[PDB]
């Protein structure tokens, strides 16, 4: 048993009709100091997967690691580790799934909620969820944190039901996605307005995008509001 | 000679020879003829199974290890069940962590580590078994041969066991003819008889003494015995 120290907030995501998108801001918070800003917690494994962590840091540092080893280990004696036996988003997370429930049964976890987003060799989409509980469950968005209480309630005016996937385009999901990044800033105590963001889709393949920020905010309206009530001036 | 250099494994002879090893290869060629052999989309185990006494049974020799795996046996049948059965752990390792089906390339060196630890060491002895192992996995169909020496190899078809030269010089004549039976399991499993016949001498193969398995793009690996078999005497 342990308690997070240098933390990482939300991590959002959906499904569209060619793949997934994923997102996460770069910070690395220290209770209410935001201590670190260079903080990359999306982490691309291969070209078709990628992990979205949030919570302890020094844990996700461990599991970067866990997931460069996968890479190495794959490859031994592989002849067929960049085709048909190249790591498929759902080897990594049922690997990750399985660290994290031994992990929280010794109790001892890795203080983390992870995403994987990722395409199928068969160009399924794959978007699931494990936390340091080990409990795992998918849906067509998944947010972690904070992002579960105000980013799945935008996301899902785009893809309520599984029917609405493949009506979506990368435009709009990344569209709802950027947006709810900025609504994640408004209300977050613990966010940052710079992140990453990336996109997996079965044709244009893995695209990272990094150092974004949140752009269009409204604040203007700041300066009518004056006093708590009866206050004039 | 020999004697001075053949008392257990952990021993070289002056010619760098391992003799226990070489015993132990010995019990395999007083085994029953089995064969193996495949198209691109099925692969075949037929094997000839022993009697005692006319009063007991045809002696089992393959086992199933996974749906998409299996393999043949030609020697000590106890051996084929302790290697059988850590492949099967394997295979099953590889569901439950990776959510993935283990590469019969992959089994296959998993069998020649295991049986290697057991002629670089003291007290221990070799295998005295020998294996034919078929799958089909990401990369289509597979044929292993396993040598309890450690030595694995993928081939299009083979035999071992007594007399077994006789289907493996027939199977390295029919190969370009059977390497296409693609699409039709009982024309690969014919062929697969006719290579096996071919090392007949005693008997001829009948119901009660004819065991033959098969694998393949939408075959999970299964077991023919008796009345089962009947259609190919």
Redesign the interface.
Known sequence: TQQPIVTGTSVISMKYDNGVIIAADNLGSYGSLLRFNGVERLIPVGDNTVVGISGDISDMQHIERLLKDLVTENAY????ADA??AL?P??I???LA?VMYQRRSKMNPLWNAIIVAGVQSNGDQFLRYVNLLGVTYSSPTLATGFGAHMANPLLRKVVDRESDIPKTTVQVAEEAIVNAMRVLYYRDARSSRNFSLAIIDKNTGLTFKKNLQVENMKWDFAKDIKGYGTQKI | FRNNYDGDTVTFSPTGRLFQVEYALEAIKQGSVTVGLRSNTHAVLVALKRNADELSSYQKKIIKCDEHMGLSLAGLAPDARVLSNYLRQQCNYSS?????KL?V??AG?LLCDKAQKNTQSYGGRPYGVGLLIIGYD??GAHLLEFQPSGNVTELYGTAIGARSQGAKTYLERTLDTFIKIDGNPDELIKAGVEAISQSLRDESLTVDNLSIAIVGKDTPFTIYDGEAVAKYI
Request: charged letters at 40%; zero cysteines.
């Open positions: 004696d592989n002849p067929l048909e036996e498929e759902s080897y997370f049922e690997y399985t | 439950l962590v990776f959510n993935r590469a390339e992959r060196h990401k990369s």
